[PDB]
Model the fold of this input.
Amino acid sequence: AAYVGGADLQALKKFVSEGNKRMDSVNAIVSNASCIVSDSVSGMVCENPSLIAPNGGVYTNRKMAACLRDAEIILRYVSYSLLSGDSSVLEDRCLNGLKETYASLGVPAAGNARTISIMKATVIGFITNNSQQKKLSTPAGDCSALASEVGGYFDKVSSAL
Amino acid sequence: DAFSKVITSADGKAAYVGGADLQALKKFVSEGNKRMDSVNAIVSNASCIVSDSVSGMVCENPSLIAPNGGVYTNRKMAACLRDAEIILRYVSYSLLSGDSSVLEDRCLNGLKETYASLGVPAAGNARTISIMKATVIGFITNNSQQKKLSTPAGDCSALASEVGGYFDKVSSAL
Amino acid sequence: FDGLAPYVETFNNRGCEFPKSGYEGPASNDDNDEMCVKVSMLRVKVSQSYAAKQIQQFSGFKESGIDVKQISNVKKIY
Amino acid sequence: LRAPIITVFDARGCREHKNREYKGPKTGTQDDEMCVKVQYEKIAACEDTAFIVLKECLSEMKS
Ligand SMILES: *CCC1=C(C)C(=O)N/C1=C\c1[nH]c(/C=C2\N=C(C[C@H]3NC(=O)C([C@H](*)C)=C3C)C(C)=C2CCC(=O)O)c(CCC(=O)O)c1C
Ligand SMILES: *CCC1=C(C)C(=O)N/C1=C\c1[nH]c(/C=C2\N=C(C[C@H]3NC(=O)C([C@H](*)C)=C3C)C(C)=C2CCC(=O)O)c(CCC(=O)O)c1C
Ligand SMILES: *[C@@H](C)C1=C(C)C(=O)N/C1=C\c1[nH]c(Cc2[nH]c(C[C@H]3NC(=O)C(C=C)=C3C)c(C)c2CCC(=O)O)c(CCC(=O)O)c1C
Ligand SMILES: *[C@@H](C)C1=C(C)C(=O)N/C1=C\c1[nH]c(Cc2[nH]c(C[C@H]3NC(=O)C(C=C)=C3C)c(C)c2CCC(=O)O)c(CCC(=O)O)c1C
Ligand SMILES: *[C@@H](C)[C@H]1/C(=C/C2=NC(=C\c3[nH]c(C[C@H]4NC(=O)C(C=C)=C4C)c(C)c3CCC(=O)O)/C(CCC(=O)O)=C2C)NC(=O)[C@@H]1C
Ligand SMILES: *[C@@H](C)[C@H]1/C(=C/C2=NC(=C\c3[nH]c(C[C@H]4NC(=O)C(C=C)=C4C)c(C)c3CCC(=O)O)/C(CCC(=O)O)=C2C)NC(=O)[C@@H]1C
Ligand SMILES: *[C@H](C)[C@H]1/C(=C/C2=NC(=C\c3[nH]c(C[C@H]4NC(=O)C(C=C)=C4C)c(C)c3CCC(=O)O)/C(CCC(=O)O)=C2C)NC(=O)[C@@H]1C
Ligand SMILES: *[C@H](C)[C@H]1/C(=C/c2[nH]c(/C=C3N=C(/C=C4\NC(=O)C(CC)=C4C)C(C)=C\3CCC(=O)O)c(CCC(=O)O)c2C)NC(=O)[C@@H]1C
Ligand SMILES: [Cl-]
Done:
């Protein structure tokens, strides 16, 4: 594990834009990961229930478990892109060749696309969240640049897949 | 009867109520269609209800995942998440049937003594239950951020009061 | 205590062209013929691997879901 | 199947945990009470999560 605190953290927040808000946006994603993942995958399914019909993309416990895992993997590489301000790791370690893996496994591209579009809207919603301050975990304010940025990272995923 | 047979079978056999039997069931319970929507709001959100309720217990008292805390180990956290779901599911059945008998007899009977013998913190259970109650009521009354279940718009305050009572039986018992 | 709990399932499936299995009673000749409640008793299980994910997810002690009361603390309260 | 697992610790005011993991220079500011942890581990496929999500799905199918 790497630990970035104290002066290293202060420095990190000078080398990336929007440093404090950026840490907050990452915290909101990782602290809500299980719902982000389940809402995205189950929204793909509820809109296209044939995905859980016999022979559908996620119709068994095992298949669904793998899909939930992959959705989490993608979310986590997006979270690291937002932490670091760069999509290099996401592109090289998670998206490079993933479309071909999914072709070989018969994972449906339209299903993936919808999981991603729900996930993108959800994560952006955690960043653009306009709840009244007493119902908000961070100081209220403008996180538009981070919302745009993370939308770009999801768009890289969608393009690759 | 049909549901008590599967509740006592305790072996995965299922009961199915559709068609005319379901039309009849909805005549024999109060607000039958709204009651099914209320149940739906629990069972289609089960995983996030459990997670948010335990997560709020923990953020209010982070020492619950400090060493020796009530849910510090994967084993203890798994048991706690499990119990929260068990309780939520007995509440869902209480709402389906309009009665808390099974919740009281099969879930709550002996539960306090069990937690006392295991050292499970009563204050942690109290917070988890309060959040689960609020979350369920939020989904039932369209007070939630997400409104994924399409219903006709109307007042479900009676059903929200009823399910709140079932959670209050849990809180009382614990 | 056996870990068993009632799983209630609410199938509101008007318009669904999927074979109907489960219900074996009379038809209503209305929309209830496309709706069903299922109940079964099953052991509730949570894996240690999911529990570990949850511990990590909760370890910020700060970020809630959207538009809810904030109750987090930095001191041990009990 | 590894991914970066990030934990963000805004620990301002938290005394029960001793801030011993980060070993670099301090600042004399509240940044000394905050830390980001990053670890690259295998992400598990959880069949209990799959089962509960499938149950959720079965009760909310659109048509
Ligand atoms: C789960 C985490 C979460 C918390 C906590 C919270 O307060 N909001 C959260 C999630 C969230 N979801 C969305 C958007 C969508 N979610 C779905 C899936 C569900 N809709 C269904 O019909 C369905 C099956 C019955 C679901 C499961 C969908 C489709 C969307 C919309 C995606 C889109 O194209 O716009 C958001 C975004 C904000 C919003 O309110 O839509 C958030 C924050
Ligand atoms: C299941 C996830 C979800 C979606 C998706 C959605 O749209 N709503 C959802 C959950 C939900 N939660 C509540 C209420 C509460 N949740 C908490 C816990 C969080 N607060 C924290 O401080 C914290 C740690 C940092 C949490 C995690 C709390 C405290 C509440 C309020 C409970 C109370 O006493 O009233 C709701 C209900 C919202 C409402 O009142 O309408 C819902 C729907
Ligand atoms: C429409 C929602 C749909 C499409 C389109 C599709 O591809 N699959 C769809 C639905 C679907 N339904 C199930 C399982 C299931 N449905 C019911 C309700 C149904 N059964 C009845 O007897 C009646 C009405 C009287 C209705 C309505 C039940 C009870 C079940 C569960 C059966 C069981 O195993 O206990 C599924 C799941 C896949 C499968 O193979 O069952 C889908 C995808
Ligand atoms: C206060 C929120 C709190 C109470 C009250 C309590 O009982 N336990 C509390 C906090 C807590 N913190 C952790 C784990 C943890 N905190 C940090 C941040 C910290 N470490 C540093 O070096 C610095 C420097 C800037 C800060 C700030 C880290 C990195 C960790 C992770 C430790 C690890 O295993 O990698 C925990 C979890 C249990 C534990 O004490 O380890 C709690 C409950
Ligand atoms: C969109 C991302 C959010 C939003 C975030 C804001 N955060 C603001 C200030 C702020 N946040 C922190 C904590 C952060 N810094 C860290 O180093 C770490 C942990 C390593 C975290 C979690 C700090 C320290 C600050 C500065 C104020 C303070 O001392 O507490 C902020 C104010 C504007 C700004 O600082 O630029 C905002 C708007 N706010 C929202 O409404 C959405 C949901
Ligand atoms: C609080 C509960 C909700 C709310 C619920 C309402 N539902 C209403 C009518 C309704 N709901 C269903 C689906 C329900 N019945 C079933 O049998 C099953 C599954 C087996 C389900 C999930 C039906 C079929 C109906 C009848 C109308 C229709 O044909 O769709 C309703 C209208 C009043 C009433 O019928 O009593 C309400 C108010 N409404 C809300 O605003 C909150 C969120
Ligand atoms: C979660 C919000 C709590 C928490 C829960 C824990 N429960 C633990 C063990 C446990 N729970 C039960 C009751 C459960 N079994 C059933 O069959 C039914 C109803 C049908 C229920 C509600 C039992 C019998 C047991 C002991 C046997 C077992 O471990 O499965 C548990 C482990 C405690 C320990 O080993 O130290 C925990 C952690 N713990 C918390 O801190 C929060 C408040
Ligand atoms: C979920 C939204 C979609 C879905 C997913 C699904 N995936 C698999 C199996 C695999 N997924 C991977 C993914 C990766 N390999 C990598 O290198 C990376 C980057 C780090 C990723 C994300 C791999 C290797 C596998 C095969 C190994 C395994 O099974 O774990 C499955 C299972 C397919 C099967 O039947 O075995 C599924 C279901 N499927 C969908 O329908 C959703 C759209
Ligand atoms: Cl049929």
In short: The helical segments of chain C are 48-58.
